[PDB]
Symmetry: D2
Subunit: 116 residues, 4 copies
């Protein structure tokens, strides 16, 4: 699994469940091409977005749809989404975890990058 997303909820002290995630790749024409999408599980994790073969070098944008998440819980949050934009695999294949911690007016994100 070369690209995984994990999301926690700082209001409830829980995984952030059923958070939509859309991944885009920058195309040769400098537009954002849809690449993969999914939703976090009961554990707040989203696995299976892509494969090592498909996850080539490029600039990727991971959009975490935080507004849609908070609105269901009856919170009107600040952000439209949390965006994570990064160059991937430019020194060979790596495994990436994007971790995010959500509050209605704040989010914190990091990356864990490992060499398989």
């Amino acid at each position: 699994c070369p690209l995984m997303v994990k999301v926690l909820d700082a209001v409830r002290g829980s995984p952030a469940i059923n958070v939509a995630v859309h991944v885009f790749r920058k195309a040769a024409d400098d537009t954002w091409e849809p690449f993969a999408s999914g939703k976090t599980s009961e554990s707040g994790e989203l696995h299976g977005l892509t494969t090592e073969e498909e996850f080539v070098e490029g600039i990727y944008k991971v959009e975490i749809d935080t507004k849609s998440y908070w609105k269901a819980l009856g919170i009107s949050p600040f952000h439209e989404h949390a965006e994570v934009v990064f160059t991937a695999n430019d020194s060979g294949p790596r495994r990436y975890t994007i971790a995010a911690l959500l509050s209605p007016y704040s989010y914190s994100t990091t990356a864990v990058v490992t060499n398989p």
Copy 2:
């Protein structure tokens, strides 16, 4: 100042100085139109981006060029930039402060919306 940006460096425990910031507004055709830009000051702040008259309700994107900041310190960072995307509301007089805390593989952003 209806819109202020503040950037901190979590490695050095300092303001993040001379960081480029670009602000865009979402146009009717779902593209991002340039709206305002600047560089953070010695205090890590960027004031005077816009005015109450120009800053109408809409979706805005604040792009903070964190990659250039880290590279200038000899650090290969993770992100291309930090992006903060939000709808401005009237409603909630008035002032938006977008704060960002930067690490090489991390950032956190918070909005302080006050009167």
Copy 3:
């Protein structure tokens, strides 16, 4: 102000007002002696805790009573308080800003150490 505390609320996107803050210094016998205290202002800030003369090198603990803050908003929070424990250095003129960002089950704290 060699020592300032700033507290933000990540649920409301606001300063955290009327938050009690206690500062302690580590005594020679490894106990924490009261040093300074106050409540955050309407801007979420607490100034005037100490003076350059009194704030010597040493280990300090800043205790932020986050539990009372959340309970007053009807929220059962996780932490008893937020604690920030650090050595003050001379060296690095001079000013310490301890910032804290509060959520019910989370907090983040950052130090801005400037001249």
Copy 4:
């Protein structure tokens, strides 16, 4: 496993490996009694601190020894340690994960609390 600690490094984009963790419980006399300790693994995780039987209701302090961690990497950090103080199990037994994200002048911590 009713008490687990997970720690990430925001400078290196990795788990925070070999971070010492000391847990204390507030005693009847309002002093902090040593309760459990250990170090994070290669995955940044610390399991096996306590048992459900031993982890009774109380106020617990989890001290994450961040200074000792950064100094080895030749960084002189700001904090002595990151402290997490919380009441546990006061509505029955729960499982607690304390997650922390470390930078030299900043740390971010949350709790994931689940009901077994």
